[PDB]
Amino acid sequence: MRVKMHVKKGDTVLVASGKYKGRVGKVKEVLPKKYAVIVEGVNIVKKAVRVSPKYPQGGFIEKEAPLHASKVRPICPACGKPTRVRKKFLENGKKIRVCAKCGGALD
Amino acid sequence: KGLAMAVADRAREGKLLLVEAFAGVNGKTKEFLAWAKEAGLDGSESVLLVTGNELVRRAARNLPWVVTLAPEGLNVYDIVRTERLVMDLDAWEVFQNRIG
Amino acid sequence: MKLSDLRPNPGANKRRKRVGRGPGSGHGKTATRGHKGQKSRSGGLKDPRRFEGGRSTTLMRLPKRGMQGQVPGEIKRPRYQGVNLKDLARFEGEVTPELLVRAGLLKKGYRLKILGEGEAKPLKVVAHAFSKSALEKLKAAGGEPVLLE
Amino acid sequence: PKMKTHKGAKKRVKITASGKVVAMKTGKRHLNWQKSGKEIRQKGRKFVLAKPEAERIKLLLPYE
RNA sequence: AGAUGGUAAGGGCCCACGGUGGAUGCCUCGGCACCCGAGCCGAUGAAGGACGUGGCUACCUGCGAUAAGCCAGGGG
RNA sequence: CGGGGGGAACCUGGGGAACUGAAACAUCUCAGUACCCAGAGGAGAGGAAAGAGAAAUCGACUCCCUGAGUAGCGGCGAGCG
RNA sequence: GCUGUUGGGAAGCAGCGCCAGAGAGGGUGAAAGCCCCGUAGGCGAAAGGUGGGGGGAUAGGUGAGGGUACCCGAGUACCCCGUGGUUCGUGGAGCCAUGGGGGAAUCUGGGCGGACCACCGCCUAAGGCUAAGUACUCCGGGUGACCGAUAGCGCACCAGUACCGUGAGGGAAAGGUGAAAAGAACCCCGGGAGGGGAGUGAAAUAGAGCCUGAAACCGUGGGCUUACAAGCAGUCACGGCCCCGAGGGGUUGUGGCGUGCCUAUUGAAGCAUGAGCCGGCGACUCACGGUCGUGGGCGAGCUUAAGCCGUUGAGGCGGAGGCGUAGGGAAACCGAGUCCGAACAGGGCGCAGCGGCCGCAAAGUCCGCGGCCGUGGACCCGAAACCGGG
RNA sequence: AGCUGGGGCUAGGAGUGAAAAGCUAACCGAGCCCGGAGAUAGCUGGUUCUCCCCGAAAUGACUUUAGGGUCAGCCUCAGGC
RNA sequence: GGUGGAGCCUGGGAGUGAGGGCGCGAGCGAUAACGUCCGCGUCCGAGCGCGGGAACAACCGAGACCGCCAGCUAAGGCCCC
RNA sequence: GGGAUGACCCCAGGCGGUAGGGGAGCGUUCCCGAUGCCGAUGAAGGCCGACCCGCGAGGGCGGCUGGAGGUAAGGGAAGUG
RNA sequence: GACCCGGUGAAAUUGAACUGGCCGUGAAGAUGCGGCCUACCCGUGGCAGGACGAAAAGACCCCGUGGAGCUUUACUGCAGC
Numbered sequence A: 001m002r003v004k005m006h007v008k009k010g011d012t013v014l015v016a017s018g019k020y021k022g023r024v025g026k027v028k029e030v031l032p033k034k035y036a037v038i039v040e041g042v043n044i045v046k047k048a049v050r051v052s053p054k055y056p057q058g059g060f061i062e063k064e065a066p067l068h069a070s071k072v073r074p075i076c077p078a079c080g081k082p083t084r085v086r087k088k089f090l091e092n093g094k095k096i097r098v099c100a101k102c103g104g105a106l107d
Numbered sequence B: 001k002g003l004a005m006a007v008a009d010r011a012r013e014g015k016l017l018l019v020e021a022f023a024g025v026n027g028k029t030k031e032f033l034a035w036a037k038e039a040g041l042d043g044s045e046s047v048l049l050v051t052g053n054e055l056v057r058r059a060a061r062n063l064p065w066v067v068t069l070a071p072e073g074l075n076v077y078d079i080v081r082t083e084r085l086v087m088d089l090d091a092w093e094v095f096q097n098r099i100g
Numbered sequence C: 001m002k003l004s005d006l007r008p009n010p011g012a013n014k015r016r017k018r019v020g021r022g023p024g025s026g027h028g029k030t031a032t033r034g035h036k037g038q039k040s041r042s043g044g045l046k047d048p049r050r051f052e053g054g055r056s057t058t059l060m061r062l063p064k065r066g067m068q069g070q071v072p073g074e075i076k077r078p079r080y081q082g083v084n085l086k087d088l089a090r091f092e093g094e095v096t097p098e099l100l101v102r103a104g105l106l107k108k109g110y111r112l113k114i115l116g117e118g119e120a121k122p123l124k125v126v127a128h129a130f131s132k133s134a135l136e137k138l139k140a141a142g143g144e145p146v147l148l149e
Numbered sequence D: 001p002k003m004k005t006h007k008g009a010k011k012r013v014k015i016t017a018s019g020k021v022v023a024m025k026t027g028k029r030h031l032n033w034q035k036s037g038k039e040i041r042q043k044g045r046k047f048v049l050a051k052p053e054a055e056r057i058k059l060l061l062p063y064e
Numbered sequence E: 001a002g003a004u005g006g007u008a009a010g011g012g013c014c015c016a017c018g019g020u021g022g023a024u025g026c027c028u029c030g031g032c033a034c035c036c037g038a039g040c041c042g043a044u045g046a047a048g049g050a051c052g053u054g055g056c057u058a059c060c061u062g063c064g065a066u067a068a069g070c071c072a073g074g075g076g
Numbered sequence F: 001c002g003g004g005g006g007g008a009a010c011c012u013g014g015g016g017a018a019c020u021g022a023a024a025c026a027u028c029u030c031a032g033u034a035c036c037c038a039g040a041g042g043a044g045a046g047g048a049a050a051g052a053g054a055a056a057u058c059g060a061c062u063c064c065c066u067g068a069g070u071a072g073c074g075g076c077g078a079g080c081g
Numbered sequence G: 001g002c003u004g005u006u007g008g009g010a011a012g013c014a015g016c017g018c019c020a021g022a023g024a025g026g027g028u029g030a031a032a033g034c035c036c037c038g039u040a041g042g043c044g045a046a047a048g049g050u051g052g053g054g055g056g057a058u059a060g061g062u063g064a065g066g067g068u069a070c071c072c073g074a075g076u077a078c079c080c081c082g083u084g085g086u087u088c089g090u091g092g093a094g095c096c097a098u099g100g101g102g103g104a105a106u107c108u109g110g111g112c113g114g115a116c117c118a119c120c121g122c123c124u125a126a127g128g129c130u131a132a133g134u135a136c137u138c139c140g141g142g143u144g145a146c147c148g149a150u151a152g153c154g155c156a157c158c159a160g161u162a163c164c165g166u167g168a169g170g171g172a173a174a175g176g177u178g179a180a181a182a183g184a185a186c187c188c189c190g191g192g193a194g195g196g197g198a199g200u201g202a203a204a205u206a207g208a209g210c211c212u213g214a215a216a217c218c219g220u221g222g223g224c225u226u227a228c229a230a231g232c233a234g235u236c237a238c239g240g241c242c243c244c245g246a247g248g249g250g251u252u253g254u255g256g257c258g259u260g261c262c263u264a265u266u267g268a269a270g271c272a273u274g275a276g277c278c279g280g281c282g283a284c285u286c287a288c289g290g291u292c293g294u295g296g297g298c299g300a301g302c303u304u305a306a307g308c309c310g311u312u313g314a315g316g317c318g319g320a321g322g323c324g325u326a327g328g329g330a331a332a333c334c335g336a337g338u339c340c341g342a343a344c345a346g347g348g349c350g351c352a353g354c355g356g357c358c359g360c361a362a363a364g365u366c367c368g369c370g371g372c373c374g375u376g377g378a379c380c381c382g383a384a385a386c387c388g389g390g
Numbered sequence H: 001a002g003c004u005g006g007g008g009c010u011a012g013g014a015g016u017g018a019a020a021a022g023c024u025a026a027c028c029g030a031g032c033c034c035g036g037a038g039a040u041a042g043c044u045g046g047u048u049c050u051c052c053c054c055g056a057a058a059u060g061a062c063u064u065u066a067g068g069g070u071c072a073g074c075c076u077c078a079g080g081c
Numbered sequence I: 001g002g003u004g005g006a007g008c009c010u011g012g013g014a015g016u017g018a019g020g021g022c023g024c025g026a027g028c029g030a031u032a033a034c035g036u037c038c039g040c041g042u043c044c045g046a047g048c049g050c051g052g053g054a055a056c057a058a059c060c061g062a063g064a065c066c067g068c069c070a071g072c073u074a075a076g077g078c079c080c081c
Numbered sequence J: 001g002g003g004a005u006g007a008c009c010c011c012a013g014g015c016g017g018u019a020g021g022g023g024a025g026c027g028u029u030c031c032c033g034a035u036g037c038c039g040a041u042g043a044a045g046g047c048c049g050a051c052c053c054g055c056g057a058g059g060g061c062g063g064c065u066g067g068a069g070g071u072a073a074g075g076g077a078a079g080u081g
Numbered sequence K: 001g002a003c004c005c006g007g008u009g010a011a012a013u014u015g016a017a018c019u020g021g022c023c024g025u026g027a028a029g030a031u032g033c034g035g036c037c038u039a040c041c042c043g044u045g046g047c048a049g050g051a052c053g054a055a056a057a058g059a060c061c062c063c064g065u066g067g068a069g070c071u072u073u074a075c076u077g078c079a080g081c
């Protein structure tokens, strides 16, 4: 039915793996289909573009590329530490994301 | 007969061990290694745990080196599969009453 | 013992005869089957147990004997299975058709008839028929024959 | 499917207790007036069939 | 007096690299076999279709002039 | 109020071959199978003894095992069962 | 579950830890119990559907002796004639069914127990209904000592499609870049296609006509060799040149020898058959029964089948039954004997472990394995033809 | 007794046939498709790795049998004498 | 006497049942046929592997496990090839 | 014959071969072995090899390609050349 | 048209080819065996003597206990009368 994302645009995430592993930033977009994500300044790549009215003078343009979701990990704003996402049943009785390192919330 | 030859082999090796009960296990794997540790079951040897006590079978069944079975299902292949063999005197008892 | 240790005894799992796989096997080409002929052909020969090549068969040429039966068919008359004395040594006391069945001596549905090839034992025996020889041995050996109805 | 007992045999022949094939004697069905008394007499008896032919007539009797 | 080499129009064998071609190896949404589950639809117009349908739309899907869709309840 | 038509096979009823096997072939077999038709349903058929058949007994029907390739059937041939 | 490390990428190797009623599996830049989807274990439905289990209703259910002799399923039972079904092919031919003819009875009735008669017994036709246990698999799910793009369904891809046929009907071929398009801006030769640098990437003979890229087939360069030779083309010896560092590799001038492969044949190089070449598909199996052999288990005893329980790649139960323990005879029937026979005659088919109670061996039987046989397409491909419905 | 467009009817042991067994969708002594179906084929062909030991027959008898088969003969293997 | 891939017995698996040349004994044929039909034997078949025979399955020689740039022989050969 | 048993050693003899019988092995797909071992310091596959062991079918070693799989001793089952 | 030049570019066939003649031989009609003669390597336009040339698993002939059509005082059945 739905693609399960433990991360959503645009909370703060830890590039767990990959070439930019360890780096941190916001999630600039979420791609469920490919189950990937774009992160600010991460997976940067140089891409070519025609001498086009949008891109006069030709040249290349740094694009931010997507990453597989299993590579990204959220950062609890409380303990500031990357954590696995549990899910808490409030008395709303809504369900909310909460850090597993500490009971903090993540939105 | 092959169900008695199987055991006996492990008996010749002394790899066979029985126990009255399992002291303090109640459905948590870690409640078992502490036991198995004190029984000389270090994990260096694959083991066939053969008892009726469910909780016990549930504690160690996830364990990479333990084969669980209700003694009502003790079979040669699983015996030979293993390096040791453990039983309740219960599981021991019904065993007797099947090769008899 | 150990799985790698488990061999079968030598000779109890023989290979197979693959025919048609090369000159080396000595079974290639004609597949141990000959050259031409109805026998090499697929399907092959009529039942060699009987057919003989056209001539009247050995069995069809033999005469038929006795009653072959008729419809509705078999007639039901009580049937007797005989057991020899020596086969009765193992028991003590009182023999009946039942026990001799559960022992594995007399089949069900048949009646019990004692034979004499052996030696009687001073035993109470119950049956549906004895032999002249069997009786003499049975009454002489201090036994108690007991016919049934 | 299981094998079917050939009745053409079970009506003519009979397997002994040792594994032999015994069929009645051929010749005295008819045309017997000028035959001997020895020839009628002897032909009224069974005869053990030749080993090869009997072996065949037993594979037809798989259940006797 | 005599005797013996170098030519290669092209051919042949051998090594090197490529062209063509798509075997082989790994892969797999798909297919096969068994066990279980489940089992009718239809004049309240079925099964299956035609023609249409998007702002731009060849085909496929989805839908029916309310036409990738309208209402309501539940889930997320 | 109901019917009509569709459904991959499965089911019951009305009809129903042949090659082939019999080392030819006609009775026989292949087989009431393949196929056609009507019908039904999630199942259909069968089903509460005017039965079986020798136990002085069994107790509707259906299906599987077994009885059994037994009893019997058959140009007593092939084969059927 | 972090770190450190090589690396394009860690899930790899090292150190220190942890969970486990979860170490099934699949993903993530490679090989992750603890990163993502999941797994064990638990939760869950306002509305439609189902509801064979639970509770409640309702239609429906029920006594005994005595006398009465009204009823008890009609062109039916019953007889004959013609058929069909049953194992029954007219057979001694009953039973069930019925196209034709004749044509009753109501318990003191009638059908049945294999023609018929009697005795004894079983049943109670000519109206109907009836769950489950049973069969199939368009559908959904789980699982495989099932296939892995000539395989597996005819289709892994826009397939019952393109194309063939008037029509029923026939019926394909065709998958893969990369971790990520970051899919090659810009410049250069060219009309373009295509390429040459630049640039991306770990890799560009991974450049989209893309993973690996074999073989036939084609071509460029190089070494040896060939224009007086002859031949199934190769083999042996020698010699010359080239390469590699008392030896080896490639090549071939001369001398010797030499009638392809397969097939079918008394016999082929054979002017007998098949094959242009290469790559892939391509033919002795399976189930039941039988018969020898064999490794084991038990052994006058061996063994269960469908099923019931258990398991979720756990096994155990189940003795109905089958083979064996006795054979001979057409059979009654006798039985270690029996049959032909008057026979105590003669003949046919039959009849009887090893050491010191023990152990060991065995008739037999059971599962495995193997060869062969019977039944089915039964080693693979191939007819001309028969038949049925369209 | 002509030729011809268009609308129609007649079909598989059946149709048409100024008759040839011609025609019936480019081969008609019984059309085509699909099915029974993997019909049958005692005929021809084809049957895929290696090494090791032995090693035939093309005879006789019967055979609607003669280019196929049953038994014996000659080969082979295991056990026994 | 003979200890041989000799023989007897029981049992499993086959293939063969289209032979051909030579020599001797015959028939048939013409005291023909690379003719045909039997008998004893031999060889090819299966030794189309080797030597001789100019070349050639069956005439002479001789039964090939493999390797040698060692020796002796059989048929047949020794002027040259 | 050793020695005791397939330990390897010595002596002697056998070993042409179609149909065909028999025996011992190689190799391909798959399963247990395997929650294991091999693998990015490079799997399977592919091109070379004049080297190693094997009678041979085949098995290792090395170099280039290749870029994520492979799978031992010992056994089991086949769509096995 | 054929033949030369530029442009496009098939076919059946094809064991592999390094493919001469004569007298002999051989499964009896040899480019491929034996002896001898001849012959420098590759081509183009031509002619058809041989590769028992190509094509179609001989229409003829026989074989098969193959088929099918036609026939009758062959056998046995059916419609029909």
Ligand SMILES: NC(=[NH2+])NCCC[C@H](N)C(=O)O
Pocket (backbone or CB within 6 Å): B057, B058, B061, B068, B069, B070
């Ligand atoms: N408790 C038991 N009986 N366990 C038996 C094994 C079950 C299952 N196959 C497992 O490995 O988890």
Ligand SMILES: [Mg+2]
Pocket (backbone or CB within 6 Å): A021, A022
């Ligand atoms: Mg870091």
Ligand SMILES: [Mg+2]
Pocket (backbone or CB within 6 Å): A084
């Ligand atoms: Mg988690």
Ligand SMILES: [Mg+2]
Pocket (backbone or CB within 6 Å): B046
């Ligand atoms: Mg293990």
Ligand SMILES: [Mg+2]
Pocket (backbone or CB within 6 Å): B060, B061, B062, B063, B064, B065, B066, B067
């Ligand atoms: Mg475990």
Ligand SMILES: [Mg+2]
Pocket (backbone or CB within 6 Å): C014, C015, C016
């Ligand atoms: Mg096997």
Ligand SMILES: [Mg+2]
Pocket (backbone or CB within 6 Å): none
């Ligand atoms: Mg088998």
Ligand SMILES: [Mg+2]
Pocket (backbone or CB within 6 Å): C026, C027, J020
């Ligand atoms: Mg052979």
Ligand SMILES: [Mg+2]
Pocket (backbone or CB within 6 Å): C025, C026, C027, J022
């Ligand atoms: Mg063999």
Ligand SMILES: [Mg+2]
Pocket (backbone or CB within 6 Å): C030, C031, C033, C034, C036, C040, C041
């Ligand atoms: Mg053959």
Ligand SMILES: [Mg+2]
Pocket (backbone or CB within 6 Å): C031, C032, C033, C034, I014
């Ligand atoms: Mg054979």
Ligand SMILES: [Mg+2]
Pocket (backbone or CB within 6 Å): C032, C033, I014
């Ligand atoms: Mg055979």
Ligand SMILES: [Mg+2]
Pocket (backbone or CB within 6 Å): C030, C035, C036
């Ligand atoms: Mg052949």
Ligand SMILES: [Mg+2]
Pocket (backbone or CB within 6 Å): C035, C036, C037, C038
């Ligand atoms: Mg033949």
Ligand SMILES: [Mg+2]
Pocket (backbone or CB within 6 Å): C034, C035, C036, C037, C038, C039, C040
């Ligand atoms: Mg033959």
Ligand SMILES: [Mg+2]
Pocket (backbone or CB within 6 Å): C042
């Ligand atoms: Mg066939």
